[PDB]
Design a protein around this nucleic acid. Structure first.
Ligand SMILES: Nc1ncnc2c1ncn2[C@@H]1O[C@H](COP(=O)(O)OP(=O)(O)OP(=O)(O)O)[C@@H](O)[C@H]1O
Ligand SMILES: [Ca+2]
Ligand SMILES: [Ca+2]
Ligand SMILES: [Ca+2]
Ligand SMILES: [Ca+2]
Ligand SMILES: [Ca+2]
Length: 901
DNA sequence: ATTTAAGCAGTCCGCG
DNA sequence: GCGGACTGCTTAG
């Protein structure tokens, strides 16, 4: 096999590299890497190296890496550009792996671990590590085994061995229900003292040194706790054995308001799963506890135990250890679904970076672009300092708030990346500038053509047309990958809808799910077999289809995020290719494109309807248009349609056969107007939306910018078995809105769009009557909690104190003295409830850590003093009044003349 | 650890 | 009450 790196580090004048050799074995080497950097040189000096602008360079080969870094410094003192890759490990990887990396994940040791620490005095601080580590579960991907290190004797209690037999048993048997599929994979090791446990753990670690290290909060808790605990017991040299090169650094992570410390383990790539989830999931969750996320992702029940975690080991060590093992498995189950580890490996190896660098789109693109240029013997420019400056973004149309009955939407495929490619936007393709006219002059095609030579953006920038820039070339490569995976995602989605339809008529038989590839549209033969399957088999196929869709989603959406991040990175001051001219060329062209095509679509539809000055485009955001289709439907007449699917078909055909060609013509004209390199504005139909045929549903409504709901029958070619709401911006979509309220508001919207005013009124009346029975957590608001200390004046709210911070201060006073009650963590999320006047907490609200039950000492009082009236008004009635007034609809029946009967 | 536009909740205080 | 200036938070692109 071709060789591939696992990890790379610079330590002084040495590169330390762990890798898989040509025979598939893991090896480690130290290499005295001599890096090269570059200086500009005279034109008369023969060279094969040129900077990105075609200026000649001489290569400087240094005796060692420190000499290279010192030369960069003196080049600054002199005032001259020091060109080349200044991150020497990336240069090392580029030299060592000068081919597309084919990696074999089965050879990469992925370790998933979790530790337990009993603490009788509150949260066990990793920097102090003053309590024994009493359990470690460590899953190894190569062995496919869970290694369980169990402390039997501690200052906080001596316990019996954990029993695998009880662990396997059902909860209803008094067992812990450790999943049967992992029972045979557990290797259990009890220890009668912590020193032996830790010494053995470290010997184990040397034998099975993780390459990828993950778990839940491992970077902020487990890793630093283990490091510091070992350090405190044995000394630093022993703790550094967690690094394969015996090198560690205390790294300070600094944000807006304060800082924290992590331990960098040289020669390990730490990918904390919480951080993977936050970057790659595109969710915003009310809580990031593993219990909460596991429930959300996998629909598994919360790990239940009696009493506080600080007494769980002494009271029920059996359950204590089982839940430690399950916790490790939950993360593996989440990854089986989401495939974020696979994603990181794919992207890391593609870019030729340390895998953990996938968290930095700047690092990722810096590496991609460096490798690309190096291939042509080109030399990257030196990074420079820039002051942070604001720059303009997208255009968003102000909608008239209203119901909108029939709607077809369209938006650009990969808008900003397509703009970069079309215009040829790149550091080295800048050709000059032209004299800019007001944007609206371009939108209306009245401005003088910017250039007859170069490719233009309406911000004034001109680009070469003779050759693609490195930014367009590299963005296209990742775009193509994105497109492939999106194809798989949408096939899986369409396949899912076939199964859902079949589920209406399940056969009464005993059979098996069909062995199929859900990434490809089901063949006719597969469809026939499906119509004969049982519900059991169909449900299993549906689950498999949806898992395949999730896999495709992960792969496509994060590739989308990477390419969009490149357009973004052009406006980040730390990016090597930072240029506000290029960042703004993209956004300004985008503004023009949207408003240009709005004009073209209005003109086209006014033509085919024989009207003048009518606005068919009702809304648009960045790269999208929403077109009112009422007149199209009305031209044939609702009576002519057999059912809902019939008019959906008709609108689908109209969009594909009339609208899209008109849109394409409009954009081809714009490309010529701007003299662009290549026509790449492809605005495909997104949604077909409307009420069910014959119903009183309103179809859709807008309240304002970035706030709307549509009843969608077909999305990007997926024809739903059941209509699906596309709701953007409204309170149903916000993590801050209570769970039960999101749910009730969604049902109000469903009823508005599908059933009409009367149905909405029936539901509102019921919700208003019953809501006080809802569980307090379900009706609690949610907020991030920053700057708690800033607004805390002797335990009371200072000036301008935010509502949620006031709640936290109330909580703090209410739990005062207790070291055992959960503390609110700065920067994390809280649940918030309003409190009735004259409550014993002495303020108008209370807040506590999200994803948790409020501590028992105050739970009863919070429940007694919860202000349901305020809660209902703020979270439910106020937003509903917004939805209904915009839709010109009443949520309560108005009096009429009929009342007199 | 890429980016801008823009929404709503709430505080403070004005608004004769 | 409602608006604007402002902070805080969160979502649509
Ligand atoms: N997370 C982001 N960071 C930077 N720019 C973004 C981000 N999301 C959207 N944009 C910008 O807005 C443009 C339009 O966004 P949109 O969500 O339609 O994605 P898109 O890139 O056009 O991909 P798709 O083909 O899925 O529509 C993007 O091309 C860019
Ligand atoms: Ca735990
Ligand atoms: Ca788009
Ligand atoms: Ca059937
Ligand atoms: Ca869009
Ligand atoms: Ca599309």
């Amino acid at each position: 096999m071709k060789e591939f790196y696992l990890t790379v580090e610079q330590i002084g004048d040495s590169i330390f590299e762990r890798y898989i050799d040509s025979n598939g074995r893991e090896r480690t080497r130290e290499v005295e890497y001599k890096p090269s950097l570059f200086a500009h040189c005279p034109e008369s000096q023969a060279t094969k190296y040129f900077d990105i602008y075609g200026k000649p360079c001489t290569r400087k080969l240094f005796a060692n890496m420190r000499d290279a870094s010192q030369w960069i410094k003196r080049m600054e003192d002199i005032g001259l550009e020091a060109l080349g890759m200044d991150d020497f490990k990336l240069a090392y990887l580029s030299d060592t792996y000068n081919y597309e990396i084919k990696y074999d994940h089965t050879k990469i040791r992925v370790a998933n671990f979790d530790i337990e620490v009993t603490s009788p005095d509150g949260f066990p601080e990793p920097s102090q590590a003053k309590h024994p580590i009493d359990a470690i579960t460590h899953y190894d991907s190569i062995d496919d085994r869970f290694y369980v290190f169990d402390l039997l004797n501690s200052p906080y209690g001596n316990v019996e061995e954990w029993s695998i037999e009880i662990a396997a048993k059902l909860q209803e048997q008094g067992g812990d229900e450790v999943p049967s599929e992992i029972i045979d994979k557990i290797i259990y090791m009890p220890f009668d003292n912590e020193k032996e446990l830790l010494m053995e753990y470290l010997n184990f670690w040397q034998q099975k040194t993780p390459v990828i290290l993950t778990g839940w909060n491992v970077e902020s808790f487990a890793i630093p706790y283990v490091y510091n605990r070992i350090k405190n017991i044995f000394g630093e040299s022993t703790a550094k054995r967690l690094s394969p090169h015996r090198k560690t650094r205390v790294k300070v992570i600094e944000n807006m308001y304060g800082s924290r410390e992590i331990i960098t383990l040289f020669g390990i790539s730490v990918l904390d799963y919480i951080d993977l989830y936050k970057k790659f999931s595109f969710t915003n969750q009310p809580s990031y506890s593993l219990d909460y996320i596991s429930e959300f992702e996998l629909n598994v029940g919360k790990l239940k135990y009696d009493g506080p975690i600080s007494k769980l080991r002494e009271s029920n060590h059996q359950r204590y250890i089982s839940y430690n093992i399950i916790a490790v498995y939950r993360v593996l189950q989440i990854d089986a679904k989401r495939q974020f580890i696979n994603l990181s490996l794919d992207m890391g190896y593609y870019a030729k970076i340390q895998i953990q660098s996938v968290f930095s789109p700047i690092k990722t693109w810096d590496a991609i672009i460096f490798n690309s240029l190096k291939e042509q013997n080109k030399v990257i420019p030196q990074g420079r300092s820039h002051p942070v400056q604001p720059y303009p973004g997208a255009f968003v149309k102000e909608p008239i708030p209203n119901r909108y009955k029939y709607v077809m939407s369209f938006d650009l495929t990969s808008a900003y990346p397509s703009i970069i490619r079309q215009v040829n936007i790149s550091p080295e393709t800048i050709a000059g500038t032209f004299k800019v006219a007001p944007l609206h002059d371009y939108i209306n095609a009245v401005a003088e053509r910017p250039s007859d030579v170069y490719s233009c953006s309406p911000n004034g920038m001109m680009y070469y047309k003779d050759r693609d820039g490195v930014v367009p070339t590299e963005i296209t490569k990742v775009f193509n990958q994105r497109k492939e995976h999106k194809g798989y995602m949408l096939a899986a989605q369409r396949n899912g809808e076939i199964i859902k339809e079949a589920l209406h008529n399940p056969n009464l038989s005993v059979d098996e799910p069909l062995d199929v590839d859900y990434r490809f549209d089901f063949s006719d033969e597969i469809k026939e077999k499906i119509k004969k399957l049982s519900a059991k088999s169909l449900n299993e196929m549906l689950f498999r289809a949806q898992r395949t869709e999730v896999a495709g989603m992960t792969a496509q959406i994060n590739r989308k995020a990477l390419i969009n991040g490149l357009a973004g990175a052009l406006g980040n001051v730390w990016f090597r290719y930072y240029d506000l001219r290029n960042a703004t060329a993209i956004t300004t062209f985008g503004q023009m494109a949207l408003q240009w095509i709005e004009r073209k679509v209005n003109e086209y539809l006014n033509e085919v309807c024989g009207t003048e000055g009518e606005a068919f485009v009702l809304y648009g955001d960045t790269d999208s248009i929403y077109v009112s289709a009422d007149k199209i439907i009305d031209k044939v007449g609702e009576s002519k349609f057999r059912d809902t699917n019939h008019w959906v078909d008709f609108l689908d055909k109209f969009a594909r056969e009339r609208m899209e060609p008109a849109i394409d013509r409009g954009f081809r004209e714009m490309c010529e107007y701007m003299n662009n390199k290549q026509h790449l504005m492809f605005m495909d139909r997104e949604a077909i939306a409307g009420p069910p045929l014959g119903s009183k549903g309103i179809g859709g409504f807008w309240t304002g910018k970035k706030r709307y709901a549509l009843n969608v029958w077909d999305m990007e070619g997926t024809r739903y078995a059941e209509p699906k709401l596309k709701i953007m911006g409204l309170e149903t979509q916000k993590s801050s809105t209570p769970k039960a309220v999101q749910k009730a508001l969604k049902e109000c919207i469903r009823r508005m769009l599908q059933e009409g005013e009367e149905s909405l009124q029936e539901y509102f009346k019921e919700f208003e009557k019953e809501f006080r029975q809802l569980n307090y957590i379900s009706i609690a608001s949610v907020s991030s909690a920053n700057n708690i200390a800033k607004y805390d004046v002797g335990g009371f709210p200072g000036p301008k104190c935010p509502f949620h911070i006031r709640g936290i201060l109330t909580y703090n006073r209410a739990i005062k003295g207790n070291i055992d009650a959960p503390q609110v963590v700065e920067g994390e999320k809280v649940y918030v409830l309003p409190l009735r006047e004259g409550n014993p907490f002495g303020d108008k609200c209370i807040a506590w850590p999200s994803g948790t039950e409020i501590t028992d000492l105050i739970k009863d009082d919070v429940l007694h003093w919860m202000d349901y009236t305020v809660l209902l008004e703020k979270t439910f009635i106020k937003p509903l009044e917004g939805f209904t007034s915009a839709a010109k609809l009443d949520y309560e029946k108005k009096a009429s003349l009929f009342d007199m009967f």
